[PDB]
A and B are shown apart, each in its own frame.
Chain A
Amino acid sequence: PQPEQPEQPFPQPSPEDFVYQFKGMCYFTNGTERVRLVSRSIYNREEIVRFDSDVGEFRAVTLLGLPAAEYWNSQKDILERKRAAVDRVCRHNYQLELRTTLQRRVEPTVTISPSNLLVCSVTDFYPAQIKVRWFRNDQEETAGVVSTPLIRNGDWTFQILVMLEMTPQRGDVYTCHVEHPSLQSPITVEWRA
């Protein structure tokens, strides 16, 4: 109930480098209602062997990975374990997950500033799911709206920039409308020409 768990690999019997990777992916949908564990053994970039729990056994994927698999699949106790790592390793960490990562919200901070172009800048937010809208006089603009892709900061915070095209004039009032889980009610920021 206390620590996180992980997946466990197995013994299979211009400088140059040889790289080996092992990724123990879990895959979540509807909370803990759909969970798929994959287990990827990788030589350099070639995925060579895999245990995907929608499958129930090891499988090679390049010639290279075949002895590795043949052997493990024979070893009854390994399957035994690897079959139940989707409950031992995946659901577990999602429970500890539900109680930390998946409760942490961070209010984005909106800023509008000139290029004639006009940039609504939405900085520092988490989770990833955000919706940004522009408005020219309480009236949704969409044709001018050009966004950057979502920007992952990798300090657990995201940003996005969302540009709007406007040939300006007096009177005109432009407004950026941002909705995000951190928030009880949407943020709006206006810019006066």
Chain B
Amino acid sequence: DIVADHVASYGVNLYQSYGPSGQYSHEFDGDEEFYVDLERKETVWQLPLFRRFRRFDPQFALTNIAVLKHNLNIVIKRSNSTAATNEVPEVTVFSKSPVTLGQPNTLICLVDNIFPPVVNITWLSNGHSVTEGVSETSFLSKSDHSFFKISYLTFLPSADEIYDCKVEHWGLDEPLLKHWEPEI
């Protein structure tokens, strides 16, 4: 319910027991600027624009995240181990641009209302999984404290090939298939 011209999270910090896994990123106007790799200890920028005059100390992330571990465990005890409630995810697939049979494009699969931040978004060409030409965003924050993740698949539209966003997440009984075709 807050009005502003631009909203940034100079600190999306996320730590959770399952794993344990965490994430650190900075978002600006609803877009991911970078994420910090928590093993390779490195800032991973999402636009080469930022890799021009700007860096960020990946150590700061690891310090932040190590604290979250500290503070999490404390609140687990304090809460009498109230576990997260597995919500149910909203899934779409659309193209990045108008589709012309024969001319290259990208499928965007948008898995929304994700909680907890644990999910297996995979792609499917004619029902055999594709792993090459894929790439996803990190977890993107939203103001009711769920998340969204977006996976991408570069493809050549042809009246021959048909695609499915297989999304695995505990909120669901079985893995969701959103399915997509070109029009012939």
Whether the Cβ atoms of A96 and B54 lie closer than 8 Å is yes
Interface size on A, residues (CB 8 A): 68
Out of B32, B33, B98, which one reaches A113, CB within 8 Å? B98
Out of B4, B85, B86, which one reaches A29, CB within 8 Å? B4
| Assembled-state Cα–Cα distance A99/B18 (Å) | 39
Out of B49, B72, B86, which one reaches A18, CB within 8 Å? B72
Interface size on B, residues (CB 8 A): 72
Specify the chain A residue showing the minimal Cβ separation from B2.
Answer: A27
CB distance from B103 to the nearest CB of A (A): 12
Segment of B123-131, B143-151, B156-164 in the binding face: B143-151
Q: Which residues of A contact B117 (CB under 8 A)?
A: 19
| Assembled-state Cα–Cα distance A5/B98 (Å) | 39
| Assembled-state Cα–Cα distance A187/B165 (Å) | 34
Whether the Cβ atoms of B10 and A44 lie closer than 8 Å is no
| Assembled-state Cα–Cα distance A121/B84 (Å) | 40
Out of B18, B50, B64, which one reaches A17, CB within 8 Å? B18
| Assembled-state Cα–Cα distance A110/B35 (Å) | 32
Q: Which residues of A contact B118 (CB under 8 A)?
A: 17
| Assembled-state Cα–Cα distance A90/B141 (Å) | 18
Q: For window 138-190 of chain A, which residues contact chain B by CB distance below 8 Å?
A: 151-157, 159
Given contacts A3-B57, A64-B78, contact A8 B64 (CB under 8 A): yes
Q: Which residues of A contact B85 (CB under 8 A)?
A: 44-45
| Assembled-state Cα–Cα distance A23/B113 (Å) | 17
Q: Is A61 an interface residue (CB 8 A)?
A: no
CB distance from B49 to the nearest CB of A (A): 5
Given contacts A15-B170, A23-B13, A156-B31, contact A3 B54 (CB under 8 A): yes
Whether the Cβ atoms of B79 and A20 lie closer than 8 Å is no
The residue in A29, A101, A151 that gathers the most chain B C-beta atoms within 10 A of its C-beta is A101
Specify the chain B residue showing the minimal Cβ separation from A37.
Answer: B10
Whether the Cβ atoms of A18 and B83 lie closer than 8 Å is yes
Out of B5, B13, B33, B64, which one reaches A101, CB within 8 Å? B33
Closest 4 CB pairs of A and B: A24-B11, A20-B72, A22-B13, A17-B18
A interface residue numbers (CB < 8 A to B) = 2-30, 34, 36, 41-45, 47-48, 64, 67-68, 89-90, 93-94, 96-97, 99-102, 104, 109, 111, 113, 121, 123-124, 127-128, 151-157, 159
B interface residue numbers (CB < 8 A to A) = 2-18, 26, 28-33, 46-47, 49-50, 52-57, 60, 63-64, 67-68, 70-72, 74-76, 78-79, 81-86, 94, 96-98, 108, 110, 115-118, 137, 140-141, 144-146, 150, 152, 170
* 30 A–B pairs (Cβ distance < 8 Å), ordered by A: A3-B54, A4-B10, A6-B64, A9-B13, A14-B86, A14-B170, A18-B17, A19-B14, A20-B15, A20-B72, A21-B141, A22-B13, A24-B11, A26-B7, A26-B8, A27-B7, A28-B7, A43-B75, A43-B79, A44-B85, A45-B146, A64-B78, A67-B78, A90-B8, A94-B6, A99-B53, A109-B97, A151-B94, A152-B31, A154-B110
